[PDB]
Amino acid sequence: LTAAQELMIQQLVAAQLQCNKRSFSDQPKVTPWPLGADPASGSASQQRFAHFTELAIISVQEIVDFAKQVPGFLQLGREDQIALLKASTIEIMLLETARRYNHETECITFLKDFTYSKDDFHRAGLQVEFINPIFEFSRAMRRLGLDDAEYALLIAINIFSADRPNVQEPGRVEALQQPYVEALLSYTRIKRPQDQLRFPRMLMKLVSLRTLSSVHSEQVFALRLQDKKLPPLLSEIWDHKILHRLLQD
Amino acid sequence: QLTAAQELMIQQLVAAQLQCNSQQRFAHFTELAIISVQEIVDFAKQVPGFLQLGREDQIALLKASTIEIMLLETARRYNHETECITFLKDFTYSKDDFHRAGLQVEFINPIFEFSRAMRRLGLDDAEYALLIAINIFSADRPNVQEPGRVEALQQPYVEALLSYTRIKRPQDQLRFPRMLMKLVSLRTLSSVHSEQVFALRLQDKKLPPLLSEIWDKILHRLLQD
Numbered sequence: 343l344t345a346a347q348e349l350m351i352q353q354l355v356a357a358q359l360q361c362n363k364r365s366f367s368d369q370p371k372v373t374p375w376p377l378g379a380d381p382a383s384g385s386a387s388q389q390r391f392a393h394f395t396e397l398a399i400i401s402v403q404e405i406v407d408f409a410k411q412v413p414g415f416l417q418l419g420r421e422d423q424i425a426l427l428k429a430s431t432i433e434i435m436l437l438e439t440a441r442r443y444n445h446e447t448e449c450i451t452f453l454k455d456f457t458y459s460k461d462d463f464h465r466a467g468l469q470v471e472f473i474n475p476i477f478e479f480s481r482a483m484r485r486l487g488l489d490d491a492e493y494a495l496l497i498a499i500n501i502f503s504a505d506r507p508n509v510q511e512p513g514r515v516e517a518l519q520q521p522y523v524e525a526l527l528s529y530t531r532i533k534r535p536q537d538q539l540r541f542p543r544m545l546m547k548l549v550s551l552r553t554l555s556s557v558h559s560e561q562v563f564a565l566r567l568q569d570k571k572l573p574p575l576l577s578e579i580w581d582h583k584i585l586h587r588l589l590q591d
Numbered sequence: 592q593l594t595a596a597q598e599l600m601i602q603q604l605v606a607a608q609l610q611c612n613s614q615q616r617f618a619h620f621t622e623l624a625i626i627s628v629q630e631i632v633d634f635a636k637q638v639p640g641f642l643q644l645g646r647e648d649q650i651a652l653l654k655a656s657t658i659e660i661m662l663l664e665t666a667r668r669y670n671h672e673t674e675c676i677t678f679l680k681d682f683t684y685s686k687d688d689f690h691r692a693g694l695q696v697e698f699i700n701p702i703f704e705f706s707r708a709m710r711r712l713g714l715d716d717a718e719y720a721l722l723i724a725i726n727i728f729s730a731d732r733p734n735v736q737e738p739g740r741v742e743a744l745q746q747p748y749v750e751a752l753l754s755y756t757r758i759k760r761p762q763d764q765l766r767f768p769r770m771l772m773k774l775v776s777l778r779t780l781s782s783v784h785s786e787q788v789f790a791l792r793l794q795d796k797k798l799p800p801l802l803s804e805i806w807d808k809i810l811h812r813l814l815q816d
C-alpha cells in the first residue's frame with residue numbers, strides 16, 4: 343500500500359472512532375428502557391419502540407457526521423450528498439449493528455452498554471421476519487472477521503455508489519469510490535495473502551445490504567401502518583429539510 | 592495461473608450457454624421472457640452442483656436469480672451504435688419500440704443504463720458464464736433451505752473468475768471488483784422489477800402463471816423434465 347493510502351485509512355478509522363465516542367456523550371439523554379413492565383404491554387412496547395428510534399437517530403447523526411469527514415463527499419453537490427445518504431444510512435447502520443453483535447451472548451450492544459437480545463427487538467413491536475435477517479447478517483460479518491480499517495473502507499465504498507437513485511453525477515461518485523476500492527483491495531492482500539477470496543466476500547456483503555435495505559423499507563411501511571410513529575428525521579429519510587440542516591452545519 | 596480442471600469447467604459453462612442459445616408486441620415480449628426463463632432453468636441444470644441441492648433450495652435460488660440473469664443476458668444483446676436490443680435471431684428493438692408495447696419508461700431506462708454500464712466493462716463469454724454462475728449460487732436469497740452449501744458451491748466460480756481476470760487483464764487490477772459491483776446493482780434492479788411487474792398487473796397486463804409464480808408450482812415441471 344502507498345503512503346497516501348496509509349494516511350487516508352488512518353483518517354477514516356479516526357473519523358469512525360471519533361463518532362463512536364460522541365454518542366456515549368448522548369447515552370444519558372435517551373428515553374429509558376421500560377423495566378418491571380409486562381412483555382405483552384402495548385404501552386410498554388411503544389416506549390421500547392421510542393427508545394430504539396432515538397438510538398436510530400443518534401446513529402443517523404453519526405453517519406452524516408462521518409460522511410462529511412470522508413474525503414471528496416463535501417466536494418459533491420448537496421442534492422447528491424443526501425441522495426447518497428438516504429440510500430446508504432440504513433446499510434451503514436446494519437454494518438454498525440453487525441459490528442456491535444456478540445455471538446457468545448447473542449446480544450447487540452448499542453452506545454456504551456445498552457445490550458439487547460432478539461426478544462427485546464420483538465417486544466418493541468418489530469416483526470421477527472425483519473429481525474432475524476439482521477442477526478443472520480450480523481453472524482455472517484463475524485465469520486469474515488473484519489477490523490477497523492476494513493469496516494471504514496467498506497463504509498466509504500458503500501457511500502459512493504453510482505447505483506443509488508436520484509444521483510445527478512454518477513461518473514464523479516464512481517470516480518470517488520475507486521480509490522476506496524483500491525485501498526481496500528491492496529489492504530486485504532497484505533493482511534491475508536493466504537486468503538485471496540476474503541476481499542470478494544466483503545464486496546458480496548454490499549450485495550446482502552441491498553436486500554436488507556429493501557426489507558427495511560417493507561418494515562418501515564408496515565410500522566407506519568401499524569401506528570408506530572417514527573421521528574421526523576427517520577421518516578424523512580425512509581419515505582429533506584431536516585437532512586439539509588445537519589449537512590449545512 | 593488456471594488449472595486444466597478450472598479451464599475445463601469454464602469451457603463447460605460457455606458451452607452450456609451456447610447450447611441454450613402495442614398489444615401485438617407485448618404478447619411477443621412475454622412470449623420471449625418465458626423462453627429466457629426456460630433457458631435459465633435449463634442452464635441452471637447444466638451448472639455442476641445445482642441438482643445435488645433440494646428442490647426447495649433450487650427454486651429459492653432460481654426465483655431470485657431469473658431477472659438478474661435476464662438483465663445480464665439483456666445487456667449482452669444490446670448494441671450501442673444503434674441503441675437496440677437483439678432477441679434470438681432477428682428481433683431487434685429500440686427503447687421507443689419497448690415503450691410502444693406499453694412497457695413503462697421509468698423502468699426501461701435503468702435496464703438500458705445497466706446495459707451500457709455492462710458494455711463499458713467489456714465482459715467476454717467466459718467472464719459472463721462465470722458471473723451468471725456466481726449470481727445463481729447466492730446465499731443471501733429468500734427461503735434458504737441450506738445457505739452454507741451454496742456459499743461453498745459459489746467459491747469455485749469466484750476463484751475461477753478472480754484468477755481468470757488477473758490473467759486476461761493483469762493491468763486492470765480492479766476489473767474483478769467492478770463486475771461484483773454489478774451483482775450489487777442487480778439486487779436493486781430485482782426489487783425494481785417487482786415494482787414494474789405489479790404496475791403491468793393494474794394496466795390489465797397480468798403475467799402468465801410461470802412469471803406470476805416467480806415474481807408474485809409450475810416451476811417443478813420445468814425443473815423435472
Ligand SMILES: CC(C)(C)OC(=O)N1CC[C@]2(C(=O)Nc3ccccc32)[C@H]1c1cccc(-c2ccc(CO)c(S(C)(=O)=O)c2)c1
Pocket residue numbers: 365391394395396397398400401402404435436438439450451452453463468472473476572576
Ligand atoms: C425502525 C427503527 C427506526 C426503530 O429502527 C431502525 O431503523 N433500525 C435499523 C436496524 C434495526 C431494525 O430495524 N431492527 C433491528 C434489530 C437489531 C438491531 C438493529 C435493528 C433498528 C435499530 C434499532 C435499535 C438500534 C439501532 C442502531 C443501529 C446502529 C447504531 C450504531 O450507530 C446504533 S447506536 C445508537 O448504537 O449508535 C443503533 C437500530
Ligand SMILES: CC(C)(C)OC(=O)N1CC[C@]2(C(=O)Nc3ccccc32)[C@H]1c1cccc(-c2ccc(CO)c(S(C)(=O)=O)c2)c1
Pocket residue numbers: 620621622623624626627630660661662664665676677678679689694698699702787788791798802
Ligand atoms: C414484463 C415482462 C414479463 C413482459 O417482461 C420482463 O419481465 N422482462 C425482463 C426484462 C425486460 C423488462 O422488464 N424490461 C425490458 C426492457 C428491455 C429489455 C428487456 C426488458 C423484459 C423482457 C422483454 C423482452 C425480452 C426479454 C428477454 C430477456 C432475455 C432474453 C435472453 O436471456 C430474451 S430471449 C427471448 O432473447 O431469450 C428475452 C425480456
